[PDB]
Each structure stands twice: as structure tokens, then as C-alpha cells.
Design a protein around this ligand. Sequence first.
Ligand SMILES: N[C@@H](CCC(=O)N[C@@H](CS)C(=O)NCC(=O)O)C(=O)O
Ligand SMILES: *[C@@H]1O[C@H](CO)[C@@H](O)[C@H](O)[C@H]1NC(C)=O
Ligand SMILES: *[C@@H]1O[C@H](CO)[C@@H](O)[C@H](O)[C@H]1NC(C)=O
Ligand SMILES: *[C@@H]1O[C@H](CO)[C@@H](O)[C@H](O)[C@H]1NC(C)=O
Ligand SMILES: *[C@@H]1O[C@H](CO)[C@@H](O)[C@H](O)[C@H]1NC(C)=O
Ligand SMILES: *[C@@H]1O[C@H](CO)[C@@H](O)[C@H](O)[C@H]1NC(C)=O
Ligand SMILES: [Cl-]
Ligand SMILES: [Cl-]
Ligand code: NA
Lengths: 189, 342
Amino acid sequence: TAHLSVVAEDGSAVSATSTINLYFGSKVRSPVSGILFNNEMDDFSSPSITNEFGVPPSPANFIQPGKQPLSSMCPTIMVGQDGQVRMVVGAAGGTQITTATALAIIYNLWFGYDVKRAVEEPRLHNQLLPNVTTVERNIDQAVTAALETRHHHTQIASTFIAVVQAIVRTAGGWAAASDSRKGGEPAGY
Amino acid sequence: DNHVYTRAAVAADAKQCSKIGRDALRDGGSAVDAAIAALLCVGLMNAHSMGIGGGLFLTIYNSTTRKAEVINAREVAPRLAFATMFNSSEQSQKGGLSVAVPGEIRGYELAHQRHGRLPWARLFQPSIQLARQGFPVGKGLAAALENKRTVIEQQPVLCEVFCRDRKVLREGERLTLPQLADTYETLAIEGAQAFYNGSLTAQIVKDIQAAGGIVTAEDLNNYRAELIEHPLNISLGDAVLYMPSAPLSGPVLALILNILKGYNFSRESVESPEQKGLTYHRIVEAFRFAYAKRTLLGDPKFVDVTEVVRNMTSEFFAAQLRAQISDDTTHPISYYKPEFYT
Ligand SMILES: N[C@@H](CCC(=O)N[C@@H](CS)C(=O)NCC(=O)O)C(=O)O
Ligand SMILES: *[C@@H]1O[C@H](CO)[C@@H](O)[C@H](O)[C@H]1NC(C)=O
Ligand SMILES: *[C@@H]1O[C@H](CO)[C@@H](O)[C@H](O)[C@H]1NC(C)=O
Ligand SMILES: *[C@@H]1O[C@H](CO)[C@@H](O)[C@H](O)[C@H]1NC(C)=O
Ligand SMILES: *[C@@H]1O[C@H](CO)[C@@H](O)[C@H](O)[C@H]1NC(C)=O
Ligand SMILES: *[C@@H]1O[C@H](CO)[C@@H](O)[C@H](O)[C@H]1NC(C)=O
Ligand SMILES: [Cl-]
Ligand SMILES: [Cl-]
Ligand code: NA
């Protein structure tokens, strides 16, 4: 998955998330066309396959011909009361996309971090099942402590949690950020 | 740079693609032309992540009309798919059977039809160049390539472009994608129809089926991107937040934020470790409540979710969940009432 955020000069905006699902999708590349085919069928629930210990399949997300599988993606545009775009944001990274998108919004809108900080700030994730709070490596360890004394079982993400691209309206114009976890860089004029 | 811009900005996960989006804006493209141009590039530089073999959603805000819309161009199960088609994760993750009908190009086409200012061919031009000339493998792709080194090195058709001397490319090494370059060129000149019902179609089907898949020409002919004129929204102070509904996770995001907005977080919420710890605990508990309800979501054309989604976007429902958040403890799974049926 990859997320992209765009604000044009007239103030129109696009938040776009796109995916072939797993790294290199199905692993089927066409020798003639070069197209790498998605494995999006894997986002459906299956009655046979048990993903997580003790976790039943979700019948609402079973395969039917013509049906679209559930997705964690959530490309988002926040618009001010005056009709001007305030934030263009989204994420890549499995079930962590939604929580990471939540985090970036929380970080900017409520904690008051600038867009770059909001993107670079450590993240955490819990999805109920499995029953564990995953924190990034450089998280404030007072947060870790506060979670563990409250009986959360935490564990450290071996890589990183999600990838966020974002744009925010400021006094100066549009502040933009690409996540250093993947190595993107913004551009504009 | 610091990345504050006076007039316009593009934030992508590869520098070269942000630049390609920016140039498109500079040449008179709308936000959509830029998005499409940048996406085409990302499909090359972050080939592991996305591209024309996959699917997408666009959330689009028009400043003239002051209306927001969503374009659903996510893959769909082929006409011959069925509930019990897979018996292992292996089967649903590798090979042609795991492939859903790609919606990417139809999605670009609908977005361009509605909002495009540049010619269709112009959106492909810099990516065609890039794919022929080549580019250094970036941080993200390099790490993906390493993560999948085994599977890639033993698949000749993947090694063809993703290896140097039979070993995955490393960061900094040059990747060229000459076949895709031709495919992109065909798309630029023949249009979207070349993929779905045109010169690429039979070969797409042949590649998928030869790998054990069941996508047919009919599947491609019938794919439609979808315009959603009324996306999900929530109110957040003086702002509205537009995001996609099911089958995407807008409803989950809405629930998380509606739960947390009742706490009135601000700068003070992270000022001392006492506040900061409580704040992050509350955040995780909101994740947990939101993910409990997620298990009832599915494609709304096949499953009735209108009630579930209504609950997930309701502030009162959120307040009911917020009140069950304990400040001093997390809870067992059953406490959040995850549901697997109705
Ligand atoms: N298909 C899933 C998303 C799949 C996904 O995000 N996969 C991973 C790779 S396993 C990814 O892009 N992770 C973030 C990254 O490392 O770029 C959805 O629509 O919810
Ligand atoms: C899995 O099992 C079902 C039921 O026996 C069968 O119809 C299907 O073809 C099998 N799928 C695979 C990929 O082996
Ligand atoms: C906004 O709406 C106008 C008029 O309805 C339409 O022609 C145009 O494509 C849209 N503009 C942008 C920048 O998307
Ligand atoms: C939010 O969505 C609902 C249904 O369309 C409606 O109350 C309203 O039109 C939307 N709000 C905005 C600001 O578009
Ligand atoms: C929606 O929420 C109400 C309580 O606020 C509950 O009684 C009802 O069962 C919910 N509907 C569904 C489909 O979960
Ligand atoms: C889940 O985790 C919490 C602490 O991490 C704990 O209260 C509970 O016993 C665990 N197990 C279940 C089944 O909820
Ligand atoms: Cl990304
Ligand atoms: Cl290629
Ligand atoms: Na930045």
C-alpha cells in the first residue's frame, strides 16, 4: 500500500491510497506487460483459514463473486468551516493504517505538533485481537510505563508502524510531510 | 527544504514522484492530474506497494463546489470466485488464484474524466521515461526486496527486473522496468480501454490464468470504478473530516476520533508523564473499542452495514463507549463486545 496527499493552487485536494496488498502482491509478474498482480483476495475472510489463535472468521467479509474485500485504508481530507482544506492525510501499513491515521490527526489537530513532527512522532497500535499493544522503538518510555502499570502487554515493533503522508494548511502556506520510515520526500512551489 | 509551500504541495513516498506530481501542477494540472501522475510513478518506484495491477480509493475535495467525493476503484472478486475457494493462507496469498480484478486504471480514468485538466497521455509521460532510464532503488523498496529475497530470487520472472546477478537489488542500485514502460505507453495512447477491453486484455487474462487464476476477459470488461458523491464525514470542532465508508475503514477512524474528542485533548494532555500516560492509555482503549465493531463490516453492496456504520459515526454511541473506558486499567477482550454475527 502507498498513500499520497495533494493540494493544488486553487485549494482543491486529493487524498489517495492505493494497493496491491502484500509486498509484490501475488508474486505474479507478467513477462510480457510487466504488470505485478495484486493478491487482494487475501483481504477476505475465509471459513477454513484461522489467522489468529482464538479469532473466528468474519462472515460479513467472506468472498462472493463481484464483492470487494474489507480494507484498512482511509484516505482522509479535513476541511475548515470556511471551505478551505486544513489537512490531507492517509497511511499505508495493514491494520495499522487506521490507527496511524488517527494518530497523525490527533498529533496535529489536538497535541499541536507541526505536520512533520506529527508524521515522525512515534506510534502505537492495538487492534483488540491479537491482545497486545505494539509500540515503536523510540516511543516515550513513560508512555510504555503508563500502559504496563495499566495492565497492557506491550511489545516493540521490530520495524516500524505504518507510513503517513500529510499536508497541513499553515500561515506560511501548505506544510507537507512524507514519512522517513519509507524515505519519501514532498515537493511543491 | 522545510517543505512549506506558498501555492501547492504533493506528499508522496518517493521524492521523484512528489516532483512529478508537482510538475504536473506547475503545467496547469488539477490536484487529480497531479495525483494520477504521481501515482503512476509510485507504481514504479514503490513497485512492491501499489500499481496498475492493484486497486485504489481517492478522496477528492473540490474548492469551487466545496463538495467532497470518493472514487472507489478497489479490486473485486472475479465472477468465478466463491466463499470456500481457499483452504490455506498460502493459497490466498501466492499465485493467480489470489488475484482480484484490478481497478486502478478505471479509477484513474473516472477521476480524470471528472477533474482532469491535462491530457491523459501527459500523465504517463514522465513515468514512461523513468521506467526506461531507470532509477536508484530507494529505502522502502530496498527493505521490501530484502524481506522477500528468497521468494524473489527463486522466481525468474520477478528476478528479471528485481535482481542484479541473481541477487535482489540493494538500496542505491539501478532498477529498470522496460516492459511496464511499454504498457504505460500503450495506456497513454490507447487509453484506459486498452487494459479492460483492448490490446492488453487477453494477455492480462493469460498471465493470471497461467499462474492458476480464474480472472476472465469478462471480469475485466465488466469492472467499473464507482463515484461516491456522499462520503463519510464527521464533525471535529470547526472542521469536517471526509473519509471512505465500508468497504474501507472510515467508520473505524470515525469511531476512534468520536470516542476521543469527548476527552478534549490539547497540548496539556502530553505536558507531563502523568497526563501523557493517561492520554495514550485512553487512545489505546479507543482503538480497542473501535476494532471491536470493525468485525461486522464488509462490502455494503453484499452485506447490510447501514446500522453498524450509523453506530460507528454516532457521537452518542461513541460517548457510551468512552464511558466504559477505565482510566486505571485495560480490559479483557470480551469487555469490548467484539461481534462476529447479526
Ligand atoms: N490490502 C490491505 C493493506 C495491505 C498493506 O498495507 N500491506 C503492507 C505490506 S504487508 C504495507 O504496505 N505496509 C506498509 C509498508 O511497509 O509500506 C488493506 O487494503 O487494508
Ligand atoms: C478448498 O476446498 C474446497 C472445498 O473442498 C474446494 O472447493 C476448493 O477448490 C479448495 N481450494 C483450493 C485452493 O485448494
Ligand atoms: C470542480 O467542479 C467543477 C465544476 O463543477 C469541475 O468542472 C472541476 O472538474 C472541479 N475542479 C477541480 C479542481 O477538481
Ligand atoms: C455528512 O453526511 C451526511 C449524509 O450525507 C449529512 O449529514 C451531511 O450532508 C454531511 N456533511 C457534510 C458537511 O457534507
Ligand atoms: C447500535 O447501537 C445501539 C446502542 O447504542 C444498540 O442497541 C444496537 O444494537 C446497535 N446496532 C447494531 C446493529 O449493532
Ligand atoms: C488481554 O490482555 C489484557 C492485558 O494485556 C488482559 O486483561 C487479558 O487477560 C488478556 N486476555 C483476554 C482473553 O482478554
Ligand atoms: Cl506510503
Ligand atoms: Cl518491467
Ligand atoms: Na516535511
